[PDB]
Design a protein around this motif. Structure first.
Motif, PDB file in Angstrom:
ATOM      1  N   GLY A   1      -2.373  -3.975  -6.893  1.00 47.15           N
ATOM      2  CA  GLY A   1      -3.666  -4.192  -5.913  1.00 47.15           C
ATOM      3  C   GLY A   1      -2.975  -4.784  -4.712  1.00 47.15           C
ATOM      4  N   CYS A   2      -3.381  -4.161  -3.501  1.00 42.87           N
ATOM      5  CA  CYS A   2      -2.995  -4.583  -2.264  1.00 42.87           C
ATOM      6  C   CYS A   2      -3.973  -4.773  -1.346  1.00 42.87           C
ATOM      7  CB  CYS A   2      -2.088  -3.589  -1.619  1.00 42.87           C
ATOM      8  SG  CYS A   2      -1.335  -3.830  -0.004  1.00 42.87           S
ATOM      9  N   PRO A   3      -4.303  -6.031  -0.897  1.00 42.44           N
ATOM     10  CA  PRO A   3      -5.499  -6.200   0.038  1.00 42.44           C
ATOM     11  C   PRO A   3      -5.163  -5.495   1.353  1.00 42.44           C
ATOM     12  CG  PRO A   3      -4.460  -8.428  -0.410  1.00 42.44           C
ATOM     13  CD  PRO A   3      -3.526  -7.284  -1.153  1.00 42.44           C
ATOM     14  N   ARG A   4      -6.448  -4.953   1.966  1.00 40.02           N
ATOM     15  CA  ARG A   4      -6.637  -4.140   3.045  1.00 40.02           C
ATOM     16  C   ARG A   4      -6.457  -4.665   4.300  1.00 40.02           C
ATOM     17  NH1 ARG A   4     -10.040   0.503  -0.362  1.00 40.02           N
ATOM     18  NH2 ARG A   4      -8.084   1.416  -1.308  1.00 40.02           N
ATOM     19  N   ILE A   5      -5.636  -5.856   4.630  1.00 38.50           N
ATOM     20  CA  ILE A   5      -5.372  -6.595   5.762  1.00 38.50           C
ATOM     21  C   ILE A   5      -4.041  -5.741   6.536  1.00 38.50           C
ATOM     22  CG2 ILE A   5      -4.011  -8.152   4.717  1.00 38.50           C
ATOM     23  CD1 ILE A   5      -4.574  -9.891   6.851  1.00 38.50           C
ATOM     24  N   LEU A   6      -4.195  -5.512   7.758  1.00 38.60           N
ATOM     25  CA  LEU A   6      -3.298  -5.111   8.400  1.00 38.60           C
ATOM     26  C   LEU A   6      -2.382  -5.923   8.779  1.00 38.60           C
ATOM     27  CD1 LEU A   6      -3.929  -2.854  12.052  1.00 38.60           C
ATOM     28  CD2 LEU A   6      -1.594  -3.123  10.832  1.00 38.60           C
ATOM     29  N   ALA A  17       0.644 -10.812  -1.723  1.00 38.77           N
ATOM     30  CA  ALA A  17       1.044 -10.384  -3.169  1.00 38.77           C
ATOM     31  C   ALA A  17       0.475  -9.035  -3.524  1.00 38.77           C
ATOM     32  CB  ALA A  17       0.409 -11.289  -4.144  1.00 38.77           C
ATOM     33  N   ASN A  24       6.857   2.432   7.538  1.00 38.03           N
ATOM     34  CA  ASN A  24       6.444   2.374   8.896  1.00 38.03           C
ATOM     35  C   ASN A  24       6.131   0.830   9.335  1.00 38.03           C
ATOM     36  N   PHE A  26       4.407  -1.460   8.236  1.00 38.16           N
ATOM     37  CA  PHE A  26       3.298  -2.137   7.827  1.00 38.16           C
ATOM     38  C   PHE A  26       2.958  -2.468   6.476  1.00 38.16           C
ATOM     39  CE2 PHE A  26       0.927  -1.716  11.837  1.00 38.16           C
ATOM     40  CZ  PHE A  26       1.150  -0.462  12.505  1.00 38.16           C
ATOM     41  N   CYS A  27       2.333  -3.682   6.091  1.00 38.04           N
ATOM     42  CA  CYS A  27       2.273  -4.033   4.742  1.00 38.04           C
ATOM     43  C   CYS A  27       1.400  -2.843   4.041  1.00 38.04           C
ATOM     44  CB  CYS A  27       1.715  -5.146   4.378  1.00 38.04           C
ATOM     45  SG  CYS A  27       2.727  -6.566   5.085  1.00 38.04           S
ATOM     46  N   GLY A  28       1.593  -2.404   2.742  1.00 45.75           N
ATOM     47  CA  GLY A  28       0.756  -1.347   1.907  1.00 45.75           C
ATOM     48  C   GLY A  28       0.889  -1.578   0.460  1.00 45.75           C
ATOM     49  N   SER A  29       0.491  -0.522  -0.288  1.00 46.21           N
ATOM     50  CA  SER A  29       0.584  -0.674  -1.585  1.00 46.21           C
ATOM     51  C   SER A  29       1.859   0.271  -1.762  1.00 46.21           C
ATOM     52  CB  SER A  29      -0.256   0.343  -2.473  1.00 46.21           C
ATOM     53  OG  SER A  29      -1.519  -0.633  -2.591  1.00 46.21           O
ATOM     54  N   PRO A  30       2.763   0.006  -2.545  1.00 47.47           N
ATOM     55  CA  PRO A  30       4.037   0.839  -3.068  1.00 47.47           C
ATOM     56  C   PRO A  30       3.878   2.185  -2.807  1.00 47.47           C
ATOM     57  CG  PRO A  30       4.096  -1.185  -4.228  1.00 47.47           C
ATOM     58  CD  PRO A  30       2.711  -1.197  -3.876  1.00 47.47           C
TER      59      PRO A  30
ATOM     60  N   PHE B  24      -6.867  -7.196  13.082  1.00 50.07           N
ATOM     61  CA  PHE B  24      -6.074  -7.393  11.678  1.00 50.07           C
ATOM     62  C   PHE B  24      -6.948  -7.250  10.636  1.00 50.07           C
ATOM     63  CE2 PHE B  24      -7.118 -11.611  10.416  1.00 50.07           C
ATOM     64  CZ  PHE B  24      -7.418 -12.135  11.687  1.00 50.07           C
ATOM     65  N   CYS B 173      -9.001   1.292   3.944  1.00 51.02           N
ATOM     66  CA  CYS B 173      -7.483   1.231   3.644  1.00 51.02           C
ATOM     67  C   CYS B 173      -7.080   0.017   4.718  1.00 51.02           C
ATOM     68  CB  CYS B 173      -6.906   2.606   4.309  1.00 51.02           C
ATOM     69  SG  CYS B 173      -5.119   2.783   3.844  1.00 51.02           S
ATOM     70  N   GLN B 174      -5.937  -0.150   4.684  1.00 51.70           N
ATOM     71  CA  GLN B 174      -5.445  -1.491   5.404  1.00 51.70           C
ATOM     72  C   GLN B 174      -5.957  -1.191   6.872  1.00 51.70           C
ATOM     73  OE1 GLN B 174      -3.568  -0.018   2.712  1.00 51.70           O
ATOM     74  NE2 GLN B 174      -3.543  -2.015   1.915  1.00 51.70           N
ATOM     75  N   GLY B 175      -6.303  -2.636   7.228  1.00 44.34           N
ATOM     76  CA  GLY B 175      -7.115  -2.787   8.391  1.00 44.34           C
ATOM     77  C   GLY B 175      -8.387  -2.650   8.469  1.00 44.34           C
ATOM     78  N   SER B 177     -10.130  -4.489   5.905  1.00 48.62           N
ATOM     79  CA  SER B 177     -10.342  -5.755   5.261  1.00 48.62           C
ATOM     80  C   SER B 177     -11.184  -6.447   5.870  1.00 48.62           C
ATOM     81  CB  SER B 177      -9.169  -6.717   4.920  1.00 48.62           C
ATOM     82  OG  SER B 177      -8.857  -6.125   3.659  1.00 48.62           O
ATOM     83  N   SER B 192     -12.251  -5.274   0.301  1.00 50.27           N
ATOM     84  CA  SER B 192     -11.154  -6.539  -0.205  1.00 50.27           C
ATOM     85  C   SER B 192      -9.736  -5.595  -0.460  1.00 50.27           C
ATOM     86  CB  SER B 192     -11.667  -7.212  -1.209  1.00 50.27           C
ATOM     87  OG  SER B 192     -10.807  -8.130  -1.786  1.00 50.27           O
ATOM     88  N   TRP B 193      -9.834  -4.755  -1.576  1.00 51.34           N
ATOM     89  CA  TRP B 193      -8.505  -4.372  -2.033  1.00 51.34           C
ATOM     90  C   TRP B 193      -8.340  -3.064  -2.728  1.00 51.34           C
ATOM     91  CZ3 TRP B 193      -7.303  -3.749  -7.269  1.00 51.34           C
ATOM     92  CH2 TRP B 193      -8.111  -4.515  -8.058  1.00 51.34           C
ATOM     93  N   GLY B 194      -7.273  -2.605  -2.853  1.00 50.37           N
ATOM     94  CA  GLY B 194      -7.310  -1.410  -3.682  1.00 50.37           C
ATOM     95  C   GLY B 194      -5.864  -1.194  -4.147  1.00 50.37           C
TER      96      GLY B 194
END
Ligand SMILES: [Ca+2]
Lengths: 30, 223
Positions: A1-6, A17, A24, A26-30, B24, B173-175, B177, B192-194
């Protein structure tokens, strides 16, 4: 689970976490 | 937003961008002076950008207003992402017009199968990165709780809903949130997440706004 913040990153520790710092810088899911 | 389309300019007037030097997280304007977003989007200083379409170019309809108070849900948990909701009080009220407008909180929770509109400036690729300039839009339905829990065993609380496609290919997706999920003119979810984005059997997970209507009311009353 990875939050979708940039977040721009350099190391995994810059990310929340569940996310990793990917190819690239950027934080992301593995 | 993976698999969506470019929204018409200023056609999602309740959408905001949260900015700390750059975009962000998204958010939703629910009052001329209050924005709602995800608690994991917290920062101690935030510039709220309203009336945005192209986040890289000033086009004339934007309002840039700094956050005066930023309040996360007191039982937010950064590890489970339970109670992933945050209120922002703007330092002055936005000017409301056809390009900047509020969206209603839900009068009741959305049923599975309800069609919703999701929007934001997050990544548009499921593998790799492409961050768009223009606001992206996506139509997607609320999934039932059982499919949600079946996609994410042990991870789904009563305060979370899954919205999306079990076959994959379309998701937030990221960004994205903190951004809105609006169904039948009511804010029912917060991005929130995925696990990844747009993956098969891994739909997006959203804060269930209808459980927080009282919390929001009481927080505003105290500020
Ligand atoms: Ca702009």
């Amino acid at each position: 689970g990875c939050p979708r913040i940039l977040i721009r990153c350099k190391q995994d520790s810059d990310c929340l976490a569940g996310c990793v710092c990917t190819n690239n810088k950027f934080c992301g899911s593995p | 937003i993976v698999g969506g389309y470019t929204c018409a300019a200023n056609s999602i007037p309740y959408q905001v961008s949260l900015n700390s030097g750059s975009h962000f997280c998204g958010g939703s304007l629910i009052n001329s002076q209050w924005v709602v977003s995800a608690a994991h989007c917290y920062k101690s200083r935030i510039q709220v950008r309203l009336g945005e379409h192209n986040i890289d170019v000033l086009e004339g309809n934007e309002q840039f207003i700094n956050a005066a108070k930023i309040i996360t849900h007191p039982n937010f948990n950064g590890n489970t992402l339970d109670n992933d909701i945050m209120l922002i009080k703007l330092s002055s009220p936005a000017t409301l017009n056809s390009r900047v407008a509020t969206v209603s909180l839900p009068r009741s929770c959305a049923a599975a199968g309800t069609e919703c509109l999701i929007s934001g400036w997050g990544n548009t690729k499921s593998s790799g990165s492409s961050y768009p300039s223009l606001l992206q839009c996506l139509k997607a339905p609320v999934l039932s709780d059982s499919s949600c829990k079946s996609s994410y065993p042990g991870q789904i609380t009563g305060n979370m809903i899954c919205v999306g496609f079990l076959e994959g290919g379309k998701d937030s997706c990221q960004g994205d949130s903190g951004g809105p999920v609006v169904c039948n003119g009511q804010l029912q979810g917060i991005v929130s997440w995925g696990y990844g984005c747009a993956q098969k059997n891994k739909p997006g997970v959203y804060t269930k706004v209808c459980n927080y209507v009282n919390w929001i009311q009481q927080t505003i009353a105290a500020n």
